[PDB]
């Protein structure tokens, strides 16, 4: 545990250099051939693209500037890019290029062809505990890294976790990521994964990421979330109650870990106690977990997506396609100066 605090210390210094002086304007749109939509969102979409000069495939997230401003999401969007360009970790998707034009913002990431954890989980139904643990361990290390940089991730869910060609996780969607040293107050996340203190408008901190990890582990192992209903308000009622029931097949160790992660009381939630992340890493459910081996990506993955080539999108759902329009007039230039 002496290797890791020295690792984190060095990690913080390269992050802070990039945080203080972000990269900008490192490619332009006509360097990419757009192939297929991989997912859509409130402000645009993510497309598979091929970089002409290298022939490499990437995932290009496209955001409409006028719509970002209209829906008051400038700070979250600037956060997303400023943080993603500054971080470096084996289970975080890599931002390779970013740029803007008259109409849009563009973030070009490594293409993670294995698809969303979400798709595989719904298809298989549920993951066995060693399978779930293999993924959970990657998130534990990743939150350890992010939180040490004073970052809060705030949208953990299987839809935002991609499976790479090695079967390892790549975290994407930094849309709500925020660098904060105090509490923060934005109601954001995804309903099933919101901690009680978010719902209750109390102010909250990084402990909400650990609550979300409890939800993720539960959903991975059960095949359904711990709190579900047809409408968010009904989901919120269940979350704040904190009553959780476990599937009969959950091990005793898993149930104990989850009781400690899905703890409504901040005072008592694992990840948020005096021993911090080590309460989690030392829990009996992770006794078989070689944390260094995971970080080094030397553990054999329980599942490897099949890919028929670079550019294969068979592990992704289909989406309706749309022309990408770029105005001949600059939109919202001042708002996105730093992008």
């Amino acid at each position: 545990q002496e290797s890791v605090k020295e690792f984190l210390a060095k990690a913080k210094e390269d992050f802070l250099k990039k945080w203080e002086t972000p990269s900008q304007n490192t490619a332009q749109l006509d360097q990419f051939d757009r192939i297929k939509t991989l997912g859509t969102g409130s402000f645009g979409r993510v497309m598979l693209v091929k970089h002409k000069e290298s022939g490499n495939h990437y995932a290009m997230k496209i955001l409409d500037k006028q719509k970002v401003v209209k829906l008051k999401q400038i700070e979250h969007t600037l956060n997303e890019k400023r943080i993603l360009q500054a971080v470096n970790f084996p289970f975080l998707v890599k931002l390779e290029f970013s740029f803007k034009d008259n109409s849009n913002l563009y973030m070009v990431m490594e293409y993670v062809a294995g698809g969303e954890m979400f798709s595989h989980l719904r298809r298989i139904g549920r993951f066995s505990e060693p399978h779930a643990r293999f993924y959970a361990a990657q998130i534990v290390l990743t939150f350890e890294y992010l939180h040490s940089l004073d970052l809060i991730y705030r949208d953990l869910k299987p839809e935002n976790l991609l499976i790479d060609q090695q079967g390892y996780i790549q975290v994407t969607d930094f849309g709500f990521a925020k660098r904060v040293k105090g509490r923060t107050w934005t109601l954001c996340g995804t309903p099933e994964y919101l901690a009680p203190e978010i719902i209750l408008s109390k102010g909250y901190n990084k402990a909400v990421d650990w609550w979300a990890l409890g939800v993720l582990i539960y959903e991975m192992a059960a095949g359904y979330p711990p709190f579900f209903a047809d409408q968010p308000i009904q989901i919120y009622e269940k979350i704040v109650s904190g009553k959780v029931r476990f599937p009969s097949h959950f091990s005793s160790d898993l149930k104990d870990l989850l009781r400690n992660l899905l703890q409504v009381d901040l005072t008592k939630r694992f990840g948020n106690l005096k021993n911090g992340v080590n309460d989690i890493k030392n829990h009996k459910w992770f006794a078989t977990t070689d944390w260094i081996a995971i970080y080094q990506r030397k553990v054999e993955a329980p599942f490897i997506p099949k890919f028929k080539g670079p550019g294969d999108t068979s592990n992704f759902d289909d989406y309706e396609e749309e022309e990408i329009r770029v105005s001949i007039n600059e939109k919202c230039g001042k708002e996105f100066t730093e992008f």
Binding site: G39, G41, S42, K72, Q73, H76, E116, F118, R122, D155, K157, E159, D173, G175, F176, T186, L187, C188, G189, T190, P191, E192, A222, G223, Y224, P225, F228, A229, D230, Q231, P232, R245, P247, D317
Partner: peptide, 20 residues
């Protein structure tokens, strides 16, 4: 079963984020 109730529910597909 809990699983059957989930699978018959309205939120078994990709879930969008929220903010306000």
């Amino acid at each position: 079963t809990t699983y059957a109730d989930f699978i018959a529910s309205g939120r078994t597909g990709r879930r969008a984020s929220i903010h306000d």
